[PDB]
Symmetry: D2
Subunit: 237 residues, 4 copies
Amino acid sequence: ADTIVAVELDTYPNTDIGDPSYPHIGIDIKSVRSKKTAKWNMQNGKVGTAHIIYNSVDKRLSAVVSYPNADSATVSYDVDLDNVLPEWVRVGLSASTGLYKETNTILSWSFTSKLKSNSTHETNALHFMFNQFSKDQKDLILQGDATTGTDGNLELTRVSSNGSPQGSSVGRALFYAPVHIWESSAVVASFEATFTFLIKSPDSHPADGIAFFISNIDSSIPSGSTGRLLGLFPDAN
Amino acid sequence: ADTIVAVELDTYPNTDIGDPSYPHIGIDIKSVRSKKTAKWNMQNGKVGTAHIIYNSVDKRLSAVVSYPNADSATVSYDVDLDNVLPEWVRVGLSASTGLYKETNTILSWSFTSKLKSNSTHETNALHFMFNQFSKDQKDLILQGDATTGTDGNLELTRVSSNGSPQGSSVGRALFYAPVHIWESSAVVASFEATFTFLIKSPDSHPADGIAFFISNIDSSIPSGSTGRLLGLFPDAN
Amino acid sequence: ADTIVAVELDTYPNTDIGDPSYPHIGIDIKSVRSKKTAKWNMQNGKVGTAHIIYNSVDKRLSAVVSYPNADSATVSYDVDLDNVLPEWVRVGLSASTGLYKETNTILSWSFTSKLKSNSTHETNALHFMFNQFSKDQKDLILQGDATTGTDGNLELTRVSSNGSPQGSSVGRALFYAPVHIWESSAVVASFEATFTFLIKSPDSHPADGIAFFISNIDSSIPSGSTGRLLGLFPDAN
Amino acid sequence: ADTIVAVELDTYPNTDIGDPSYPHIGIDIKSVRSKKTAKWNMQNGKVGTAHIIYNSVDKRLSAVVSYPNADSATVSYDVDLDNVLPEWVRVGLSASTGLYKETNTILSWSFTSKLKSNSTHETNALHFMFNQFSKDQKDLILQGDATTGTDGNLELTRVSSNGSPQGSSVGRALFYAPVHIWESSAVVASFEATFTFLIKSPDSHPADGIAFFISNIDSSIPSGSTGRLLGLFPDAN
Ligand SMILES: [Ca+2]
Ligand SMILES: [Ca+2]
Ligand SMILES: [Ca+2]
Ligand SMILES: [Ca+2]
Ligand SMILES: [Mn+2]
Ligand SMILES: [Mn+2]
Ligand SMILES: [Mn+2]
Ligand SMILES: [Mn+2]
C-alpha cells in the first residue's frame, strides 16, 4: 500500500480508533491512529489557516491551526521523515465525508521545500502558492471527488450547485511535480506548508476532516477511505 | 509544430539565417531568426550567468549575460507573450552541437513565475532553484542527449567520460510541472529565470549554444534540430 | 530640498496643477505635476491594492491599482532612476488631507529590492512585509500625523477615536533601513512594492490621496505639503 | 549590560571557561560559557558556510557548519527566546583576535525573520541578503575594527593592506533595522541566518572565532571583549 505522513484536522471523534472525544489536530505516521493530538476548537463556517513545519536537524513535525479572533491549537511529534518517507514524494490535500458531512473547501495552499548542501552554492528549493484555483489547474493532480474553479476555490469533497456538502465523498489534490525531501549532500532539509480552509456543515456534527499529506509519488485514494479514513488509509490499523 | 519563445546564447555565427558575424545573445519568437540580438564576448571555459525577466504590464522580454570580471551583454524585445504562448506552458533549457562542438553544462537554474489577481489575497507563484542535479532528477523531463548527475551538473549535450564534448548532439531539460503564465483575473504576471553555464570546447570555434525556452506543455525536440537550430526549431524559417 | 520619485493615488482633481478632471494614478518625478496619469475609478470605503515595479534593464516605472470585482488602472513612465535618485534611498508611504478629507489607512505594505552582480554569488536583496502594524513599530520612521496600531493598521493621516478623518493632516512612514538601489557591479537592479489601502470619507469629494515614494535618506515632510502636495513636495512646480 | 544570544564558531579552546579541547560550534545564552557545543573540524583558509534556524513552536536553536568536500558539524539547544530576548532586537556578526589571530572575513550574510498571525493576511517578514559589501554599507552598523569593501567582503577584525590578520582586534556588524521577533498575535515566529566565512591564519593555532548574535537594539562592544570573549561578553561568567 501507499506510505503516508499527514497532519489531520479531524472534525469528528471516532473514539474506537483512538480519536479523543472532541475535534482535534493530529500527526499521522503511516496510520489514521495519530501519534499525537491536541484539542481543536473547530468553528463551523469560519475560514481557518493551518501551518506545518519540519526540518531534518530538529526531526520534529509541528502544526498550528487558528481562526481570526481565536487562540491557536498546536501539535508536535519527534520523527525522522528520512526513515519514514522515500527520497522523492508528492505533497497533497485530502478530505472525506461519511454519514456525517461538511464542505472541505481550500481557499489557498502554499508549500516550500529547501535542501541546503555543503557546496558554497548550497540552496535547492521548490515553492508554490495557490490563492486562486482555475477550472483547469494543470499543476494539480485531482483524485476522487476533488474539483477546482468554484468561486476560485478547491473543493476536496462533493458540493451540490448550492454550496451544500454531500456525504460519503473522498477527494485529494497533489502538486503535479515530485518533491525531493532527502539528498546525500544535504546538510539541512526543511519544508513548510500553509492552507486556508472553510469547513461548513448544516449539521451540529460535521465530518470527517482535512489532511495535508506527503506520500510516495504514485499515491492514490485507497479503496473504502471515505469517512474516518480521510482518503489517506485503507484501514484503521 | 511546437510554439517556442527563447533567449539564445548563440556561440556560432550562421550569417545565412541572420546571425551577426560574432557570438550573440538573441530573443527568438517562433523562429531561430532572432527578433533582436546583441554582441556577446563569450569566454571558452569560464562559468557564466544569464538572467531573463518579463512582465505583462511592460510586455518586454529582457536578458542579461555576464562573467566574473567582465562587462554584461543585454538584449530586449517588445512582445506580448499572451499573444504568442498558450495560457499553460513548460519552461526549459536546450543546447546543441553540430560539426563544431562545445560542452553545454548547466551548474544552476532557477525560475520564478508570479500571477497577482485583483483579490486582496492576490499572489499565485511557482519557484524552483537547482544548485545540484542528481542522477535521477524526477522533477525534470530530460529529452534527447541531456543527462543529470555528472559533478552534480546538468549536461544538455553528450560528453565522453573525460569531459570532452561530442558533435551532432541535442538535449533539453523541462521542469516537470506546467506553469500558468496567463489567468483571466491576473492584474500583473511576471517571470524571471537565471542559469549559470559552462561552455568549453577544445576548438577556437565552439558551437552551437544554449537557450532558455518556454513552449506548449507537450513540446519535444524537433527532427533535425542539432547544430544551428538549438533543439528548438524544425527549420530555419 | 528633498529628491522624490512617487506613484500617487490622487483622489482629488486639482486641474490648475495639471491633474485630469477625475481621480487618477500618476508617476511623479521630482514634481507633484505627474509625468503620466491614468483614470482611477476610486471606491470610497473599499479595500484596494496597488503594485509598483521597476528594473534598471527596462528603465520603466509601472504601477497597477485594483479593487476586488473591478477592472485595474495602470500607468507607466520611461525613466532611468539611476539618473534621478542617489545610490542610497529610503522608501515610504505618504498621505494628506486639506479642506476635503479622507482616511489614508494602510492595511499592508511589502517591498523587495534586488541587485544582481556579475559575481557567480550575485544576489543582494532587501525584503519587508507588514500585514499587522504594532503601536511601537521600531522598523518604521513615522513623520507628521502618521500613527500605527489602530486595528493593527498604519493611519497616514489623523483619525478621531471614531474612525472619522481630520482635514489639513499630513503623515508619512519610511522603512528604517536605507535601501541600496544602484551598485557599480550590479548587472540588474529591480524593486517591487505592494500596499493595500482603505480611503473612506463621509464626503462625495474625498482628498487628497496616498503615495508610495523613494527619497534621499534624510527626507522629511516639506513645510505646507498638506492637501494637493501629498506630503511629498514643498510647492506645485 | 547587553542581552546576548549567539552561535559561536570558536577556533581556540579556552578550557578554563568550559571550551572543549578542540575548535567547536556552540550555543551561547547570555554567557561565553556555551550551553551546548559540538566538535568542529575547522579548516585554515577554506571558505565555510554556517546555517542557524529557530522557531517559537519547537523553541530549539540549531546550527550547522560545513565546508565543500567535508562532513557538517551541528549543535542544538532547547531554549524559548521569548524568555531570553526582548520583543525587538538587532542581529549581527562579531569576531575577535587576541595574542593568537586569524582573518574573520564574511563573504556573504543572509537573515530571514517571519511572524505568522491568526489573521487570514498573516505573514510579517524581514529578509536581507549580502553577497557583496561596499566601502559605505549604510544598512550595516559597524562597531570596533569591522570594515566593509575590501574585495567586496566584510572584515570583522583588523587586516593589514596584505591580507595579514592583526592580534587584539574586535569588530561587529549589525543590520541597521531592528527586528521584531515576538508579537502578541503571532501563532508562529521563525528565523534563519546564513553566513559564509574565511578564517585564515599564518599560525597553527588561530584565534578566536566568529559569532552570529541577537541583542538588545542599543548593543555595543563590551570593554575588554577581545580574544576569548568574541566581542559579545564583558567577562567569562
Ligand atoms: Ca475522526
Ligand atoms: Ca548560430
Ligand atoms: Ca490632486
Ligand atoms: Ca574559545
Ligand atoms: Mn483523529
Ligand atoms: Mn543566433
Ligand atoms: Mn495628481
Ligand atoms: Mn567556546
